[PDB]
Amino acid sequence: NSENNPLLIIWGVHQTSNAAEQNTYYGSQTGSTTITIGEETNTYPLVISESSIL
Amino acid sequence: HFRKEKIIDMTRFSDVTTNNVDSACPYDTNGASFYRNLNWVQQNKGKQLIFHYQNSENNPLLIIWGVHQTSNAAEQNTYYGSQTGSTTITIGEETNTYPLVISESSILNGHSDRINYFWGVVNPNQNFSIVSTGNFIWPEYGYFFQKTTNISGIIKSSEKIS
Amino acid sequence: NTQFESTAKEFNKIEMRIKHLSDRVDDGFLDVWSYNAELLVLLENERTLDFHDANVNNL
Numbered sequence: 001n002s003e004n005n006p007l008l009i010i011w012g013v014h015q016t017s018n019a020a021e022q023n024t025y026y027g028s029q030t031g032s033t034t035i036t037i038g039e040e041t042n043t044y045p046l047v048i049s050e051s052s053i054l
Numbered sequence: 055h056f057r058k059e060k061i062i063d064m065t066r067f068s069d070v071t072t073n074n075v076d077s078a079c080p081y082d083t084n085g086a087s088f089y090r091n092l093n094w095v096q097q098n099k100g101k102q103l104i105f106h107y108q109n110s111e112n113n114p115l116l117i118i119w120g121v122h123q124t125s126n127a128a129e130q131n132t133y134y135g136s137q138t139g140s141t142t143i144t145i146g147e148e149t150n151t152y153p154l155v156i157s158e159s160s161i162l163n164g165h166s167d168r169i170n171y172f173w174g175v176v177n178p179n180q181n182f183s184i185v186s187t188g189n190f191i192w193p194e195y196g197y198f199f200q201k202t203t204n205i206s207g208i209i210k211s212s213e214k215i216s
Numbered sequence: 217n218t219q220f221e222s223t224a225k226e227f228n229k230i231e232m233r234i235k236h237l238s239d240r241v242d243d244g245f246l247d248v249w250s251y252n253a254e255l256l257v258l259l260e261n262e263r264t265l266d267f268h269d270a271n272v273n274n275l
């Protein structure tokens with residue numbers, strides 16, 4: 001951030017329903033994101049679980 | 055207003071055991087019993103159980119359940135016959151997922167395992183559902199209640215009500 | 217004329233800072249009410265005695 005103002009960023013992490021849905025979207029039973037802002041580290045490991053359909 | 059009611063018919067689940075007890079919760083006499091409103095289900099054998107409910111009452115419903123944290127693979131095998139057992143309970147649009155956790159704890163009341171208790175409120179005309187493959191203590195009974203605006207709290211005393 | 221008084225001031229074991237905030241909130245109101253109550257009585261008592269003096273002088 002070379003700007004003279006702080007920057008707000010919004011991201012999302014996908015929680016898939018099953019192995020089949022994970023395979024269709026990403027072609028691998030993996031997928032994990034680590035986003036680091038300054039000195040904080042945010043790690044979002046892959047989570048696969050059904051939820052009620054909304 | 056506050057009413058206990060039966061919310062789940064536990065007899066409708068097959069290939070499984072209900073109303074399980076333990077000596078850590080005796081009757082007034084002695085022995086082995088369990089919480090009245092919470093039904094311990096064992097020997098799921100990896101099989102998945104499904105339940106659905108709608109609060110058609112004109113009052114919100116309070117339900118309390120528990121999730122069993124076993125000590126080791128042997129204890130998990132004895133109680134449920136499978137190294138699995140995970141419950142997802144959905145109240146309205148919230149989803150609560152309790153994956154299987156196996157870990158020793160210090161022994162309290164003869165238990166190195168734990169049953170952790172959670173609760174939720176089912177509003178009138180709202181639904182809740184349970185999907186469990188084991189390690190779950192079901193909310194067989196619940197309380198229909200009517201909220202009041204003025205919140206009081208808990209009075210801690212040894213005296214009796216005069 | 218007061219709002220409904222509550223005793224629900226408990227927070228969980230890992231929220232001692234929130235409990236301290238609740239503790240000092242009640243400390244603040246305790247100081248506010250105590251100081252105002254003391255000077256209310258002191259001021260009114262002096263005026264009440266002056267009120268009787270004025271009535272006697274008026275007769």
Ligand SMILES: *[C@@H]1O[C@H](CO)[C@@H](O[C@@H]2O[C@H](CO)[C@@H](O[C@@H]3O[C@H](CO[C@H]4O[C@H](CO)[C@@H](O)[C@H](O)[C@@H]4O)[C@@H](O)[C@H](O[C@H]4O[C@H](CO)[C@@H](O)[C@H](O)[C@@H]4O)[C@@H]3O)[C@H](O)[C@H]2NC(C)=O)[C@H](O)[C@H]1NC(C)=O
Pocket residue numbers: 204217218219220
């Ligand atoms: C949750 O907690 C709150 C706070 O304690 C409660 O709210 C109080 O409720 C009471 C009763 O409902 C209220 O008291 C009533 O106030 C009315 C309005 O008073 C103003 O106007 C009159 C003129 O009309 C003035 O005389 C008065 O000084 C005020 O300026 C009064 O009309 C009511 O009078 C009743 O009592 C007298 C005797 O005392 C009778 O002769 C009357 O006929 C009548 O029955 C009464 O005084 C109070 O103001 C509320 N306070 C607040 C902060 O809300 C909630 O009730 C409570 N909830 C539950 C479920 O308990």
Ligand SMILES: *[C@@H]1O[C@H](CO)[C@@H](O[C@@H]2O[C@H](CO)[C@@H](O)[C@H](O)[C@H]2NC(C)=O)[C@H](O)[C@H]1NC(C)=O
Pocket residue numbers: 107108180181
């Ligand atoms: C709560 O559960 C009820 C019962 O399952 C749902 O209502 C039913 O929906 C089906 C269609 O899927 C209808 O055929 C039934 O007639 C409905 N029953 C009633 C009593 O209306 C209801 O949709 C669920 N609520 C939510 C928010 O999902």
